[PDB]
Amino acid sequence: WEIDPKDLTFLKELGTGQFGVVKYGKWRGQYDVAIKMIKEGSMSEDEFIEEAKVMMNLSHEKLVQLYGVCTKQRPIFIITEYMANGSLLNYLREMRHRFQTQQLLEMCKDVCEAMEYLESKQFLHRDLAARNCLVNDQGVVKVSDFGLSRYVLDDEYTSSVGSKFPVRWSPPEVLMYSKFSSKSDIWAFGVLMWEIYSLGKMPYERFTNSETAEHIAQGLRLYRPHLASEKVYTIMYSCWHEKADERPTFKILLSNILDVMDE
Numbered sequence: 001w002e003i004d005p006k007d008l009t010f011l012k013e014l015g016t017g018q019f020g021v022v023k024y025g026k027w028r029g030q031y032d033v034a035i036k037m038i039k040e041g042s043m044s045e046d047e048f049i050e051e052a053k054v055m056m057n058l059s060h061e062k063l064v065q066l067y068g069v070c071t072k073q074r075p076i077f078i079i080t081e082y083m084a085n086g087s088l089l090n091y092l093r094e095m096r097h098r099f100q101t102q103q104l105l106e107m108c109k110d111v112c113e114a115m116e117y118l119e120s121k122q123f124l125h126r127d128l129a130a131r132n133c134l135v136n137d138q139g140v141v142k143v144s145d146f147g148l149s150r151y152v153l154d155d156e157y158t159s160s161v162g163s164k165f166p167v168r169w170s171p172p173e174v175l176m177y178s179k180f181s182s183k184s185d186i187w188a189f190g191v192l193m194w195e196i197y198s199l200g201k202m203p204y205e206r207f208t209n210s211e212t213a214e215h216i217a218q219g220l221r222l223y224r225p226h227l228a229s230e231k232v233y234t235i236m237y238s239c240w241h242e243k244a245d246e247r248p249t250f251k252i253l254l255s256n257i258l259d260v261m262d263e
């Protein structure tokens with residue numbers, strides 16, 4: 001789990017975000033990696049490091065792999081699989097003038113496969129959204145930052161009443177009671193399918209976060225993006241039953257997606 005910084009070569013800065021700067025590099029001069037330099041005070045570092053091996057054990061081809069951490073210096077580095085096309089949210093917005101509708105369904109299948117694997121381990125993602133998915137050089141979408149919100153220090157992001165909480169991806173039981181489960185990841189997946197089929201538009205864009213939480217509590221839901229067929233919309237809408245126990249599992253969604261692909 002501990003990577004020696006001597007084996008890393010840094011090659012290009014890719015960007016910066018909430019948890020720090022990301023660079024593309026090589027491990028032992030040969031293997032592509034992404035390196036995130038964790039922003040001081042953003043994470044519970046000791047707790048993350050003791051559990052980095054847990055996340056390293058979650059190996060599925062549609063999860064962005066965590067390769068290890070460098071912790072004998074400041075800042076700590078988190079080393080992962082390199083995803084050359086970057087965030088899914090930005091990639092969807094760039095796809096707007098060049099795509100086949102068939103590719104949108106294959107992106108949903110990729111994310112669903114990763115989430116069926118996490119569900120099989122009873123591992124909660126807690127912030128599934130297009131901004132937390134990445135895209136590789138072959139256009140395969142993979143899920144990233146799985147479970148990370150448990151280690152974030154800023155209550156503005158982790159509390160349901162924080163200005164930065166992912167209200168637009170959350171079901172009623174999370175907004176009201178902070179009750180997370182595999183079924184709150186199912187709700188967020190349906191919003192992510194809506195983001196894919198809307199080519200990266202913001203969900204509930206006419207509403208503030210406070211108005212969105214009221215809108216969802218009143219039973220109102222996202223309408224059908226024009227690119228989604230009625231069979232595709234039926235799948236995303238199934239993720240949004242008010243009662244969590246009425247929402248499907250990721251194994252059922254995957255079979256439904258594969259049925260639409262087949263037909």
Ligand SMILES: COc1ccc(F)cc1C(=O)NCc1ccc(-c2nn([C@@H](C)C(F)(F)F)c(N)c2C(N)=O)cc1
Pocket residue numbers: 014015016017022023034035036055064065066078079080081082083084085086087134144145146147148149
């Ligand atoms: C699998 O990782 C985890 C799993 C569980 C967990 F709890 C935490 C982590 C974690 O912290 N990973 C650190 C990390 C996250 C994202 C990128 C990354 N980001 N980006 C872009 C948006 C940009 F712009 F930031 F560069 C890539 N292309 C990236 C790329 N990998 O090519 C790089 C490293």
